[PDB]
Symmetry: D2
Subunit: 121 residues, 4 copies
Amino acid sequence: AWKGEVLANNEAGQVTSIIYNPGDVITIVAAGWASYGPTQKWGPQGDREHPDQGLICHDAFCGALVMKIGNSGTIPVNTGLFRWVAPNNVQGAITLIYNDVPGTYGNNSGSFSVNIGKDQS
Amino acid sequence: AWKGEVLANNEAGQVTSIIYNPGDVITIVAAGWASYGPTQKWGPQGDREHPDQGLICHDAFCGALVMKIGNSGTIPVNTGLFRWVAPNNVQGAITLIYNDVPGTYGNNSGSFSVNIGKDQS
Amino acid sequence: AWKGEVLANNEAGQVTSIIYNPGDVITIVAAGWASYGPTQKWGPQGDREHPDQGLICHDAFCGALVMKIGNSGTIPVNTGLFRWVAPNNVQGAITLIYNDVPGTYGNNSGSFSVNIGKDQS
Amino acid sequence: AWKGEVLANNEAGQVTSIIYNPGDVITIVAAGWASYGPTQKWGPQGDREHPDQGLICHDAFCGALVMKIGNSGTIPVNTGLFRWVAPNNVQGAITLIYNDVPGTYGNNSGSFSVNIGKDQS
Ligand SMILES: CCCCCOC(=O)c1cccc(C(=O)c2cc(O)c(O)c([N+](=O)[O-])c2)c1
Ligand SMILES: CCCCCOC(=O)c1cccc(C(=O)c2cc(O)c(O)c([N+](=O)[O-])c2)c1
Ligand SMILES: CCCCCOC(=O)c1cccc(C(=O)c2cc(O)c(O)c([N+](=O)[O-])c2)c1
Ligand SMILES: [Ca+2]
Ligand SMILES: [Ca+2]
Ligand SMILES: [Ca+2]
Ligand SMILES: [Ca+2]
């Protein structure tokens, strides 16, 4: 299992110790509060009122938690995933990232606390 | 495992199939959007700007997911719990509930989708 | 989880740390060599050539590993059980016992090494 | 998870669907009765009285269950392995094999039933 913090202001994303292999079943739980700029804060699902303009992951809101697995594209995590199996041919190390627009992470604040474990399979 | 929806207007809470027994290790993942009355919606950690004026759970925000286990008081769930063990003396059936003030559930809207499983021990 | 030795001369059996509750899924692995009398020894499936003339568990061989769950009657374990769920209405502490005839444990020798864990459910 | 039978007379061993990847934790439970020649039978620990006269695995008895992970050397399985982790550099498909002397498989009989799964990590 891996536990750690994902800073909203970390454009590169936080690499985890988890290597996703074919067939693997994993669980992720994400909590806390962060911002893409405003004094207001949002949870891991982000700000459902913010537009999608140039976000790294078009499938989640601004300020959501997303991930990449190896060199996949971005995949939504949000609050987390229960006993989840990736699509065919997705494999590698799990990096977690705050969903925002490239070049705009400087004004971000806060962090999410995230756990990831491999489940029985 | 149990998977189901928790309606925000359900004052009694959603009973699950899960019986928490001494020594159990559990994982919960909650997702979605709901409202304790306003047109806006919030995720499982609720509205961090809303005052607590009589919530069923004073350790979580208005609109957050909470639970009771058997005869326990409310216990925060929020986005979820990763490989969690219950407080001393806590055991029994898990009921999931939207955190709002007694008697004001009629104007709530939405639902959270929740998964619960028992982990290896 | 629980790891321990079960002596073949132990008539009362070895009580583990595991309490079996409804819905639980367990795995058992048993290894080693023991005897009900002879200078020879057998593994956890026992002696497939020996008669049953009053074994505590009529569904396994003399010299096999068996168990009780709470006040159940005996259940075969043998080499082990993989992600097993018990019959209805069985609950309580797991007691591991060597399968022999009541009153004859005194000439027994050796032990099995046993791992028990609860699995994800 | 994977379940299947491993014949005593199969010199090549039985390929499973389990790919052991670095950091995997696995459980294996084996049961049953087989023979490397004699009319009598033995369990997955094999025959503790028979000499090693060129077994494919010199760390288990003749008639024991062993395995390869990819093109590893032989690894003892016996009755099973509880929440086990492989040696460094060991990875690939798990192949289960009856431990006998090469070219003597033709007088073998019986089989073992084996479950393998990956465990929480
Ligand atoms: C795809 C990379 C090129 C984008 C350049 O344009 C932007 O930076 C751009 C364009 C439209 C909306 C936004 C936006 O939603 C946005 C998001 C932010 O977190 C933020 O801090 C700022 N900001 O600092 O101005 C803008 C940003
Ligand atoms: C029948 C209910 C008893 C009323 C007690 O509630 C209050 O007086 C009171 C005062 C300030 C804020 C709140 C509150 O946070 C609150 C929370 C709500 O979800 C809600 O639907 C209502 N509401 O519609 O009246 C008020 C409630
Ligand atoms: C030995 C004290 C009295 C128990 C009574 O045992 C029997 O009546 C009975 C009758 C038939 C077979 C067996 C038997 O399978 C049996 C099994 C043993 O492990 C053992 O050590 C002995 N023993 O030492 O005599 C007998 C026992
Ligand atoms: Ca920003
Ligand atoms: Ca309300
Ligand atoms: Ca005896
Ligand atoms: Ca042979």
